[PDB]
Amino acid sequence: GPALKAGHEYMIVTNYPNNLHVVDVASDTVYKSCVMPDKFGPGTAMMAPDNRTAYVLNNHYGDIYGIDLDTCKNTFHANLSSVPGEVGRSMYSFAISPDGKEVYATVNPTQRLNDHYVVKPPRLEVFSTADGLEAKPVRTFPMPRQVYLMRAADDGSLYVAGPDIYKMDVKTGKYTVALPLRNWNRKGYSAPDVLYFWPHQSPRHEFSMLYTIARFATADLLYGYLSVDLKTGKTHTQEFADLTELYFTGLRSPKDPNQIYGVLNRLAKYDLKQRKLIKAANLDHTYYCVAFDKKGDKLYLGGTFNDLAVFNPDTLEKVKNIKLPGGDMSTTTPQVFIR
Amino acid sequence: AVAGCTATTDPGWEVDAFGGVSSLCQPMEADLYGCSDPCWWPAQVPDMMSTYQDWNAQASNSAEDWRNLGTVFPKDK
Amino acid sequence: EQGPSLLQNKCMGCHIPEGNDTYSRISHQRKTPEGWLMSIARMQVMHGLQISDDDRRTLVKYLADKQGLAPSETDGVRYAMERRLNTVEQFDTQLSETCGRCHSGARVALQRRPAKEWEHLVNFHLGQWPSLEYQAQARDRDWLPIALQQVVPDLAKRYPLESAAWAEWQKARPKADALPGQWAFSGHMLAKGDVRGVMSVTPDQGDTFKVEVKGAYADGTPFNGSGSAILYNGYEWRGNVKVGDANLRQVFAALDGEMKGRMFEAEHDERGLDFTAVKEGKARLLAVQPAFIKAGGESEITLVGSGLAGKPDLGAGVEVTEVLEQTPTLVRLKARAAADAKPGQREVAVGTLKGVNLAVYDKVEEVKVVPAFSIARIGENGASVPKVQGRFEAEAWGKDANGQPLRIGYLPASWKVEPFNERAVEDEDVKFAGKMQADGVFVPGGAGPNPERKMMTNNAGNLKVIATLADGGQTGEGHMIVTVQRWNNPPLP
Numbered sequence A: 001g002p003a004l005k006a007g008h009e010y011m012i013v014t015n016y017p018n019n020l021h022v023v024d025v026a027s028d029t030v031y032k033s034c035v036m037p038d039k040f041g042p043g044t045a046m047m048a049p050d051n052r053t054a055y056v057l058n059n060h061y062g063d064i065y066g067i068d069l070d071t072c073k074n075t076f077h078a079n080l081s082s083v084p085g086e087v088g089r090s091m092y093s094f095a096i097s098p099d100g101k102e103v104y105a106t107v108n109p110t111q112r113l114n115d116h117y118v119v120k121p122p123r124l125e126v127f128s129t130a131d132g133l134e135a136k137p138v139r140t141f142p143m144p145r146q147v148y149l150m151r152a153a154d155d156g157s158l159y160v161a162g163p164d165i166y167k168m169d170v171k172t173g174k175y176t177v178a179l180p181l182r183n184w185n186r187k188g189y190s191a192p193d194v195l196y197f198w199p200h201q202s203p204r205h206e207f208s209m210l211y212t213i214a215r216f217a218t219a220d221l222l223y224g225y226l227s228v229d230l231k232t233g234k235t236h237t238q239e240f241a242d243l244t245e246l247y248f249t250g251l252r253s254p255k256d257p258n259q260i261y262g263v264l265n266r267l268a269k270y271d272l273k274q275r276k277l278i279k280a281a282n283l284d285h286t287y288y289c290v291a292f293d294k295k296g297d298k299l300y301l302g303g304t305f306n307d308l309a310v311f312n313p314d315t316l317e318k319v320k321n322i323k324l325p326g327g328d329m330s331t332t333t334p335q336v337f338i339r
Numbered sequence B: 001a002v003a004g005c006t007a008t009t010d011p012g013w014e015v016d017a018f019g020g021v022s023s024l025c026q027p028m029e030a031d032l033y034g035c036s037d038p039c040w041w042p043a044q045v046p047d048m049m050s051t052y053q054d055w056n057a058q059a060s061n062s063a064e065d066w067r068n069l070g071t072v073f074p075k076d077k
Numbered sequence C: 001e002q003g004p005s006l007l008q009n010k011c012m013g014c015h016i017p018e019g020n021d022t023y024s025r026i027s028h029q030r031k032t033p034e035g036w037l038m039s040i041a042r043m044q045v046m047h048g049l050q051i052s053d054d055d056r057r058t059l060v061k062y063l064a065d066k067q068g069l070a071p072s073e074t075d076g077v078r079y080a081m082e083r084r085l086n087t088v089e090q091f092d093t094q095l096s097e098t099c100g101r102c103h104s105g106a107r108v109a110l111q112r113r114p115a116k117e118w119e120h121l122v123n124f125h126l127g128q129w130p131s132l133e134y135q136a137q138a139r140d141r142d143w144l145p146i147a148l149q150q151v152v153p154d155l156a157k158r159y160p161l162e163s164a165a166w167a168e169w170q171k172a173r174p175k176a177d178a179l180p181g182q183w184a185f186s187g188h189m190l191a192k193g194d195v196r197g198v199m200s201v202t203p204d205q206g207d208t209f210k211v212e213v214k215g216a217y218a219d220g221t222p223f224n225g226s227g228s229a230i231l232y233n234g235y236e237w238r239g240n241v242k243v244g245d246a247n248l249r250q251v252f253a254a255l256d257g258e259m260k261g262r263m264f265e266a267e268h269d270e271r272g273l274d275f276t277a278v279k280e281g282k283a284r285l286l287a288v289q290p291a292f293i294k295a296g297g298e299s300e301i302t303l304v305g306s307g308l309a310g311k312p313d314l315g316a317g318v319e320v321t322e323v324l325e326q327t328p329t330l331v332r333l334k335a336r337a338a339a340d341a342k343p344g345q346r347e348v349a350v351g352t353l354k355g356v357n358l359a360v361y362d363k364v365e366e367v368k369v370v371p372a373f374s375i376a377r378i379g380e381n382g383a384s385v386p387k388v389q390g391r392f393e394a395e396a397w398g399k400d401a402n403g404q405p406l407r408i409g410y411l412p413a414s415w416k417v418e419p420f421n422e423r424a425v426e427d428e429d430v431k432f433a434g435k436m437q438a439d440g441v442f443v444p445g446g447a448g449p450n451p452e453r454k455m456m457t458n459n460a461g462n463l464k465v466i467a468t469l470a471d472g473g474q475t476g477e478g479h480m481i482v483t484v485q486r487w488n489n490p491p492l493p
């Protein structure tokens, strides 16, 4: 429909039926809507380096589609079940190359036979975005189990979230531990717990996830923040508060990085340095995913139902709600970019 | 824990990790498809990733169409 | 059709024939009747199997008899078939975290399989639900390796396809001709009371029967019904009896001319009664109703049993003042305990028949709410699911003449609900969660989001169940959580 304007800020969010909506961040209104092919699930999207193509893991975690936002055209399609007799699923595990020429996806395949199933080892499959609607693996490597979120750093390296965070070479497939989680033998603490299905493309250009950890049942529950700088590969972890409630997603304000905002049943504002809660706000309902605009003047709350809550991050109060056409956003992740 | 509730608390379904119902989703419908899409609680909530793919067909908007959600076991008759 | 021909016509094609009516997978597993129904139902839902309800019933009967479990192989896990969903399971941690964190661990224990069939099962789980290994109690360990190397071998040793029990059961298994006759029964429905009567079982086609229930509750409400039942593996009794306006399912184990199990509403499994019965022909003394008599009191006591003949003796300090009725299966009498009667249990007898005890008590010391912990669920209000009630009883305790604890029984009481924690007070749970009735039955609120609540949340709540004895005002406390519905509800939890 209407092509996106240059210099203008936009936000993409996927909605239940099978829509991808473009939100004009300036007016807080729906700019346009695109109907997506096949079926929804998870509907997780990420913008390509061209600020024009959105890549979406859809069709029940078994396919990846490229949609051109200016025209709503399906320009790319990769099915994750190219190996005969196997069904491949991706647990939110896909990433776009810095130049936007390849798409990576780790596939947990299952061989389905006549009277039984056989779970096979996972594998990373590389697809060339130039291959269109019938893209097939141009390269494949072995992957460890329990791999989920992945983000391609600027130097082409692939940061893979699994039992540990790995740094992977997409040409050789060799990887090393970039940040130990399960094997983080930190004395006085337990191993961290990480549950994250939201690959935020935040203004800070970092791969961040929240985690919880017990500091020695008497063990003290803490919330932490982990981050991988996608420019320099620099990693960082740090607890920012004693756990009194749960948060699904959390982001640092691009305006003030010392402030981290987490969300679920309440929207909390924390002081990283002081490890202190500065303010919490009650929500109209549960929200899963936070999203900050470029300057950090607005805080969007998505996921769950069909409405985006718009908050003033300073006052921590809901300014308005953007009602999206259709239904539930479910586990979708709101993505902000400048066209 | 009770035999006919789940013990996988992420934050849960019957009971949250804290042993109550507050850390749960509010309302439950807000976390329904988050639970259903990836088959997080397959024994209680029907899986749309694999088994019951069109479970929410008449209830895309769970806040207003939660009544259209049916039970899945193929009972006699 | 016949079991063998249906097995081939409907399963072959996906399941490979291995010889004389045996197929891959199918002939290498043993399960309960509802277990077999669950496997076939999975074939329809997951794999597209086309099969009518009639033919499905035929296959279940066939497979349940051929590959079932011996009675002793169900010992301790019968609550699953009896739909006792408030049961707090007690299995080892490995089985609980790995296999009982989704569905019950009893669903696992109610099956017998060789190691390869347990290995195929693990692959099916991770294959059908890829997110399995990313969930709580899975993402913290190498789930697949542990399940295949540690769990599969343990499951095979604990629940093997072959056992002496099954072998000896296949030979000693009685026929259905051993069940027809009259059956004196006794039972109790939580928050409703005692029940007693006679169940007439008469034969019908094959292993099915016609059933007639004739009785009443201790409060005078009738318990008369008509229905039918089938018998699986020589002891697994499954019946349906329309008592009044409700269809009640009967899940009993019929062994040695004795039936033990539970009878519940086909639609609501929290609404049921414990059930024990005895076939005519053997002299038994089932129960005393009530099973307590306050010292210095007058009470109508009725004895339930089979082949009752003789004079009732209720023990020291208890006087039988008027035998209101005396038939072979029911003896009604008026009794009176002296104000001097020492507190303690009395061995009741009708002639030479002993078996049941009568608690004579002076004062109630301690009160326990039963169940101590339970789950109530919102429902209806347009939803595809029913409300799940909390049903309670106040269990009285005292001390006998020897200073030892004495369980009196279930005494009448007043019931109320209070916020379990500060959080419940703040959210006004007691106002939205539902209504506690005088009889001890808690009816939860309607399903769906509730606009009147904070965050338009459901009528869920964290409640404290308070019972206050009518006899002396002694209080007891329980814990109830009113939660959300579940749409996947197979025969076994």
Ligand code: HEC
Pocket (backbone or CB within 6 Å): B042, B043, C035, C038, C039, C042, C098, C099, C100, C101, C102, C103, C107, C108, C111, C121, C122, C125, C129, C132, C147, C151, C155, C488, C490
């Ligand atoms: C330990 C590794 C496990 C054992 C042993 C079993 N399970 Fe499960 N399981 C799950 C679902 C959703 C189902 C059936 C679908 C439904 O309930 O509607 C099952 C079923 C079984 C069965 C029945 C098999 C049959 O009929 O052929 C058995 C014997 C069984 N399971 C054994 C879900 C889960 C789950 C949550 C993601 C876990 C961790 C397990 N099951 C673990 C075990």
Ligand code: HEC
Pocket (backbone or CB within 6 Å): A113, A114, A115, A116, A117, C007, C010, C011, C012, C013, C014, C015, C025, C026, C029, C039, C040, C042, C043, C046, C047, C048, C049, C051, C059, C117, C120, C121, C124
């Ligand atoms: C083809 C479309 C099928 C038909 C027809 C039937 N079954 Fe099946 N069955 C099929 C598969 C792919 C599998 C393996 C994965 C799984 O769902 O478990 C099975 C498995 C079974 C099992 C094993 C169950 C377990 O938990 O280990 C049993 C006991 C079984 N199937 C029984 C069965 C019966 C009795 C059928 C006739 C009505 C039948 N299956 C048909 C695929 C197919």
Ligand code: NI
Pocket (backbone or CB within 6 Å): C366, C367, C475, C476
């Ligand atoms: Ni007490």
